[PDB]
Each structure stands twice: as C-alpha cells, then as structure tokens.
Amino acid sequence: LRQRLTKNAQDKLELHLFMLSGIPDTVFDLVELEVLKLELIPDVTIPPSIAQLTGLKELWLYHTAAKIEAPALAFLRENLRALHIKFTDIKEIPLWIYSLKTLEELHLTGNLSAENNRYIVIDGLRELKRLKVLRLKSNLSKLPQVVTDVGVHLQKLSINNEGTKLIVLNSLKKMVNLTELELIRCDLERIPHSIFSLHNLQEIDLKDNNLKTIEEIISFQHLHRLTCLKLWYNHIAYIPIQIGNLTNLERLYLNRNKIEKIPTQLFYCRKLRYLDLSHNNLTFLPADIGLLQNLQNLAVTANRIEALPPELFQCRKLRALHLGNNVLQSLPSRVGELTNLTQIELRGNRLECLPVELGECPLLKRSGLVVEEDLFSTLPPEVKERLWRADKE
Amino acid sequence: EWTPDKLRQKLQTNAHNRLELPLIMLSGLPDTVFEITELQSLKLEIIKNVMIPATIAQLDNLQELCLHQCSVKIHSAALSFLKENLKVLSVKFDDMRELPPWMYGLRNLEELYLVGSLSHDISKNVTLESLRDLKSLKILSIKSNVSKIPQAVVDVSSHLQKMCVHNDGTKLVMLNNLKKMTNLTELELVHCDLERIPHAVFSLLSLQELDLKENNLKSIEEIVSFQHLRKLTVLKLWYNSIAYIPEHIKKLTSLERLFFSHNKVEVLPSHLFLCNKIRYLDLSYNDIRFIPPEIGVLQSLQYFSITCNKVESLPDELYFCKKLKTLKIGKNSLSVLSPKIGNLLFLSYLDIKGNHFEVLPPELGDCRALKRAGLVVEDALFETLPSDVREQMKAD
C-alpha cells in the first residue's frame, strides 16, 4: 500500500482501490493517506478503523454502495470534507451523506433526475450546511429547487448535462455567494440572465454551451469581479466590441471557437494574461497585442496566422508562445528580446529555419523548445550547444 | 496486468505534438486504453493479431494511429468511428500481413506515412488502389522500394499536397502517373535512384517544393518549362552529383529555397548569381573553387552556406549584399577575412571554424547582429580579440 500511494493534482497523498471484493483494513491502517478512491467496490461497510486515517479528507465514491458504522459515521462527520459520488442508480447513493457536516465539496455525477426521485433524494442536502462546491454531471433537464434553497452558501456550481438545456428561469438571484460558475456541455445556445443578475462571480466558464452569439457581454461590466471568461468550445464566430468594456478579464479562453477576426476593442483590456485563441479561424494578429503587456501565454495553436508582427514581441512577459500547427512562414528575431519565454511551440508550422536569436532566451530549454529535429539543426552548433546544455544543465 | 494508472503514467507525446500511447511488445490492446479518453494517438509497436473493440468510441480526441509491425483487426462500429474521426495514419510493414486492409476503409484521412518494405508487385496492390476512398488525403510518405509509381497515386492526384518516397536504391519508373498529378504541391522523391530529372517531375504543373535528395542527377537541362512552375519556391537538390548549374535557372523568378550542397560542382557559375530573387542558397561541402563577382545581384539572399568548400578567394561583391543573415564559411580554404563586413547589419550566423587565419581583425566587432554564441570561433582565437571586441558579442 505504501508503494501504491500516489499524489493527485491537489498534491495530496492518494490511493485508488479499483475492483476489489471489499476494502482492506490495512488501507485503513494508513495514516499518511489523504485521498482514498473507492471505485467499483460492491456493498462494503466502512470500519471504524478510519480513526487511524486522520489525514483523510477526500472520500471518492465511484459506483460504491457503502454501508457505514456509527463511530466511523461520527468521525467522517467531524473529519471528512470532500465527497465525490458517481452512481448509475439513484439508490446507489448512500443515505448517510446527508448526516455529514464538515463536507464542503460534493460531486454528484450521474442522473439525479428520475420519476419521483427528481431531486427528492438530494432533498437531504438541506442538512448539508458548509457545501460550497456542487458538481452535477447529471443530465438535469431543469435546475433543482433544492439548489435554489442551498445556494446562499454555495460558491461553485459546475453543472454538466452532456447535452440537455437548462431552463434557468433567473433562479440564481437567491444564490448570491458564487465565485465560480462552470456550465459545461449544457447546450444552452445563449447566455442566460441569471449569471447577469449575480455579482460575486470571478470565474465564468460556459464550455460547450453551443454559444453562437455572445452579444450580451455588454452587460458584463455589471459583474465587476469577473477575471476568467472561459468562452471556449462554443460556436462563437465573432467577438462584439463591448468586450473592451470588460477591463477586469485576466484569462480569456476562446479556443476551439469559430472566431475569424479579433476586433481591436478586445485588445483594449490591459489585464489579459492568458489569451488562448487556439483552434480558431484567425488569419492575422493585430499589432495592438504589444499593448497587452501582462500577456503571458499566447496560444494561437492551429490558426491561419501567416506572419507574426514585430509588435507581438513588444510584450516582454510572453512565457509560453504556443505557435504550433500554424502557417508561420518565419519567426522574427525579436523573440531574442523576450526573457520570460519558457516553452515555445513551433513544430507543425511552415517555419523555414529557426533564427539564432531564439537561443537568446535564458529560461528556454529543449523540453520548452519543442520543434522538429531538422528545424533544431538550423541553429548554430554553439547556440545548439547552449540549448542542449539548457536541456542538460 | 495493465491498470489504467499504468497507462496514464505511460502517457507521452509523439513527433507530431499529439498525446501518444507507445504500446510496445504486447500481445494485444488492454481494455483500459479506452478509459483515457483524452488520448490523441496510439503507437502500436509489434502487437500482432489485435482486435479493436467498439469502446474506441470513447476516444473522442483520437486523430492519429501509428502501427509498427502490427497485424491488427477492427470491429464494425469501431471501423465506422475511426472512419468518422481519424485524420493521420502511419503504418510500417516488415511483413505484408502487418499492413492491414481495413485502414483504407476510412475517408477522413489527411496524412499517411506508408513506411515499410513493399514488394515489387506494386500494381497488384488493390489495397493501395483504395486510397481513392480517402477524400482528404494530402500527405503520402511511402518509405519503401517504390519501383513503379502506383495508379493508387493516380487516384489521389488532386487532393494530395505532400508526396514523399524513400525508394532506397530502386529506379522510379512509369512516369505517366506522376504526370497525372494536378494539384500536388510538395514532391519529395528522396533517393528514387533517378539518373536524371524524370520527365514526370517536369510534367508537374502545380509543384511548390521538389526534393531529389540522394538522386544521382546528371544535369538540369529541361528548365525551359520550369517557368510553368511559377508556384514553385523550394528546390531541394542537395546530397547529389550535379557538377554545374546552367543559365536556365533564370526561368523561375519565384525560386526562394535552393539546395545544392554536397554536390560535384567545381566552379560556381555567375549566371546562377544572375537571379536575384533567390533568398536561400545552400552549397555546403561542395568543390567550389571561387565565387564569380556577379553575386552582388543576389541582394535578397539571406542564406549563403559556402562552408566546408574548396573556395580560396572570396570576392568583395558578396559583402555588398547586406541582407545575408545566415552565412557559414567554416572549414573553407580562405586566407584572410574581408575588413568590410560592417555593412551586414542583419548577420546572425558567422562560422569560421577550421579555416586557417592569421590574425582576427578588429572589424569583427563591426558586425551588429553578430553574437558570441552565433560567432563560432575557437578559444585560442577567442583570446586573440580586444576586450571591448570580446564584450561586443559576449555581452548579449
């Protein structure tokens, strides 16, 4: 089990129990474990030996019908703080999850909408008090009234319907404490007004909502705190100029959209740091990108940009210039002025040869400088020695 | 044996910047492969008699397969899904059975890399002649002994854009097929055992990049009709046995990339320098004796690699051209370096290693775009420089 221990994205010690008859007690003897992952465990009972699992904070329940002992129930009530529940049947969800009081993150993935069980099973999340993250990959036809009751304290609402439209009906007005809203794969086809009625949001994701038009964003100046407008994976074909009113944006994820031209008004926002416009229909890059001094990772991967303007290198904070799969004929030598560049992607381009000034970037290394081997060979063997040494040293 | 965690920790990137699983030395595919739905490519290396399930439908991000010595079968709905999803293929066939007949059933194919060992019975390959099913095939790299060009290549005359052969010592014949290329832009005939330029290569009308590397070309003579390749900008003719370049290269006024390195040319012509459009001129490791003074016309030349040649006298006309950015004269037969080098404002590369020099002049400090890492000089001659001249290129 010690050699089975791993680490997650949150840098917590991890243990994935997959396809076992039950759950081992030596797993429960562990003390350094933080996230235990119960996947495909048929009808097991949690022993009270979880008192040894003091660092345990995230119980991951995947298709696991779990029965619970009372002292272990009290321990999880006073210790356990993050529970992810995936189920195929609405009877598979444990009924003791409502008795949990220290739980803040819940991930109910799997259909909650059923006849006479449509949000009546999770009507016990009113007992949950500190719940702040509520992920729902559950094919919800309409958003529950129970989350309208709960959302006074809820701070994140990630709803994945995998192709079912929400009839929001402006019901998020009672849900005032959200800082993040991730409506992913909802097929909304339009931005509703519930996001507009809210005020505390700072990270708005509308991934794969089939957003053909995003003209409503003029009212987004009302949202004075938004900093990450993730309008990616949609059918967005153009950007209205009123995005220039959104000076508070820091990351504008418009990748995998149908946008063909960037208006210069979008380029007014000085606070943009992650301008990812990859996999789009952009043919040219405006020079006003030099004004965006705070930009760090400009990802225009798989675009129609033939020539990079020199003003692109005016912004000295470019850390990851993802220029791959584009039609860049030649990369100008002004990239030698950039210092923060750590990884530049040029493989898959029309790049004739790699200029010498590309070796002037200190932090760039071979892992950062991903490029075709013959394109790498165009650099001088002393400059190639410098870059190979950056790979070594 | 292969838990999804093991395949997740196996994950890496390929040479095409895609998420590739390098499944190597296995009996078949695990069913836990398809749990990694973010995968974009699989490298199957020596995994024979493999039956792909329909669960490949979970691989929505998949757009590339790389089959290395694998006699793989597929299932019907998986066949339909990869017909509606896949873009890139790369199959190597050490044995004929390792090349699968199912792979031609797709229609969304763009790029194909047909490396392997094809038999000389090429026209009998009805599996090849199924590339007409592919309605988007643009890249076709056959690393095999292609003696006679297939009519499979005829059936993909229009949609193809990149055509690559590594014939590996076999003469490329049946030229009428390569005559039938209409919209082909990149012809890469690497080592097709071409004793000269084929008339098929010259019957191309829409070519943009021609590579005849390791093809023992005797002459470049038919060029009176290279004027119809106004779309051509890249001429790749290095690692060859060409001994002269006649005036006929004046026909193409759109030529930018010219390769003539490692050739049998003993004296560079001036009528080659008569063309001024040429921006990339590669002549490294040649037998050139001297440069005629007509090179001053070549102002747009940004690459003149004359390094490792026999050149003993370098005229001052070449230093008049200031646009020359990548200049390599390393291991040449020169004696002294020209003091007038300061007019080359845009000059990043200078290589003089191996060539005999008496004293490095202070005028090497006159170069503006030169860099110490870009100026590859020995440590002993690095000592033979003034400290200010040292810092001129050393301090960024």
The residue in chain B having the minimum alpha-carbon distance to the alpha carbon of residue A302 is: B17
> With the C-alpha atoms ordered A357, A363, A367, A368, is the resulting torsion angle positive or negative?
negative
Please, are residues A359 and A334 in contact by the beta-carbon 8 Å criterion? no
Chain A residues near any Cβ of chain B (below 8 Å): 6, 16, 18, 324-325, 333, 345, 347-348, 352-353, 355-357, 359-360, 370, 372, 378, 380-383, 386
Cβ-proximal residues to A163 (8 Å cutoff; 6+ apart), any chain:
A139, A185, A187
Buried b / exposed e over B333-364, threshold 16 CB at 10 Å, is: bbeebeeebeebeebbbbbbbebeeeebbeeb
Please, are residues A235 and A259 in contact by the beta-carbon 8 Å criterion? no
Distance CA B320, CA B342 (A): 10
Chain B residues touching A6 at Cβ < 8 A: 5
The residue in chain A having the minimum alpha-carbon distance to the alpha carbon of residue B352 is: A380
Chain B residues touching A357 at Cβ < 8 A: 348, 371
DSSP A224: T
Distance CA A31, CA A54 (A): 6
**B209 forms bridges with which residues in the sheet?**
B186, B234
CA A365 distance to own-chain centroid: 27
Cβ-proximal residues to A328 (8 Å cutoff; 6+ apart), any chain:
A305, A306, A307, A308, A346, A349, A350, A351
Tokens representing A192 are: 């509703």
Tokens representing B198 are: 């084929």
Nearest to A82 by CA among A108, A63, A64: A108
Tokens representing A201 are: 């949001």
- CB contact (8 A) between residue A380 and residue B3: no
The residue in chain A having the minimum alpha-carbon distance to the alpha carbon of residue B375 is: A382
Please, are residues A303 and A326 in contact by the beta-carbon 8 Å criterion? yes
Residue A126 phi/psi, 5-degree rounding, is -60, -30
Chain A residues touching B396 at Cβ < 8 A: 360
Nearest to B208 by CA among B159, B153, B156, B161: B161
Nearest to B289 by CA among B321, B320, B324, B332: B332
- Helix (H) or strand (E) holding A184, with range, is strand A180-184
Chain B: closest CA distance from residue A41 (Å) = 16
Nearest to B243 by CA among B261, B219, B213, B226: B219
Residue B373 has its nearest CB partner, among A352, A370, A383, at: A383
Residue A357 has its nearest CB partner, among B4, B5, B348, at: B348
DSSP secondary structure letters along A136-156: EES--SS--HHHHHHTTS--E
Tokens representing A194 are: 């519930």
Buried b / exposed e over A156-181, threshold 16 CB at 10 Å, is: bbbbbbeebbbebeebbeebeebbbb
Distance CA A274, CA B139 (A): 33
Residue B17 has its nearest CB partner, among A324, A360, A383, at: A324
**A39 forms bridges with which residues in the sheet?**
A18, A62
Chain breaks in chain B (C to N over 2.5 A) after: none
**Secondary structure (H, E, C), B53-117:** CHHHHHCCCCCEEEEECCCEEECHHHHHHHHHHCCEEEEEECCHHHCCCHHHHCCCCCEEECCEC
Residue A386 has its nearest CB partner, among B348, B349, B373, at: B373
Distance CA B307, CA B323 (A): 18
Interface test with B, best of A60, A63, A364, A382 (most B CBs within 10 A): A382
- CB contact (8 A) between residue A359 and residue B373: yes
Chain B residues near any Cβ of chain A (below 8 Å): 3-5, 15-17, 257, 280, 303, 325-326, 348-349, 351, 369, 371, 373-374, 376, 396
Chain B residues touching A390 at Cβ < 8 A: none
Amino acid residing at A381? P
Chain A: closest CA distance from residue B177 (Å) = 28
Cβ-proximal residues to A104 (8 Å cutoff; 6+ apart), any chain:
A81, A82, A130, A131, A132, A133
Please, are residues A72 and A47 in contact by the beta-carbon 8 Å criterion? yes
Burial of A201 (0-12, 13-18, 19+ CB in 10 A): buried
Chain A residues touching B3 at Cβ < 8 A: 18
Residue B374 has its nearest CB partner, among A6, A353, A356, at: A356
Q: Obtained via which technique?
A: cryo-EM
How many contacts, defined by CB atoms under 8 Å, are there between A and B?
47
Residue A345 has its nearest CB partner, among B16, B17, B373, at: B17
Distance CA B105, CA B89 (A): 12
Distance CA B71, CA B51 (A): 9
Tell me the C-alpha to C-alpha distance, in Å, between residue A89 and each of A110, A138, A238, B361.
8, 11, 42, 84
Please, are residues A13 and A36 in contact by the beta-carbon 8 Å criterion? no
Interface test with B, best of A352, A371, A376 (most B CBs within 10 A): A352
Residue A337 phi/psi, 5-degree rounding, is -75, -25
DSSP A322: B
- CB contact (8 A) between residue A360 and residue B326: no
Please, are residues B377 and B353 in contact by the beta-carbon 8 Å criterion? yes
Distance CA A280, CA A258 (A): 5
Residue A360 has its nearest CB partner, among B5, B17, B396, at: B396
Cβ-proximal residues to A297 (8 Å cutoff; 6+ apart), any chain:
A273, A274, A275, A276, A318, A319, A320, A321, A322
Interface test with A, best of B110, B190, B371 (most A CBs within 10 A): B371
Chain A residues touching B280 at Cβ < 8 A: 352
**Secondary structure (H, E, C), chain B:** CCCHHHHHHHCEECCCCCEEEEEECCCCCCCCCCCCCCCCEEEEECCCCEEECHHHHHCCCCCEEEEECCCEEECHHHHHHHHHHCCEEEEEECCHHHCCCHHHHCCCCCEEECCECCCCCCCCCCCHHHHHCCCCCCEEEECCCCCECCHHHHHCCCCCCEEEEECCCCCCECCHHHHCCCCCCEEEEECCCCCCCCHHHHCCCCCCEEECCCCCCCCCCCHHHHHHCCCCCEEECCCCCCCCCCHHHHHCCCCCEEECCCCCCCCCCHHHHHCCCCCEEECCCCCCCECCHHHHHCCCCCEEECCCCCCCECCCCHHHCCCCCEEECCCCCCCCCCCCCCCCCCCCEEECCCCCCCCCCHHHHHCCCCCCCCEECCHHHHHCCCHHHHHHHHCC
The residue in chain A having the minimum alpha-carbon distance to the alpha carbon of residue B378 is: A382
Residue A13 phi/psi, 5-degree rounding, is -65, 140
Chain A residues touching B326 at Cβ < 8 A: 353, 356, 378
Distance CA A113, CA B335 (A): 86
Chain B residues touching A15 at Cβ < 8 A: none
Tokens 């003579």 -> residue? B221
CA angle B129, B130, B135 (to 5 degrees): 120
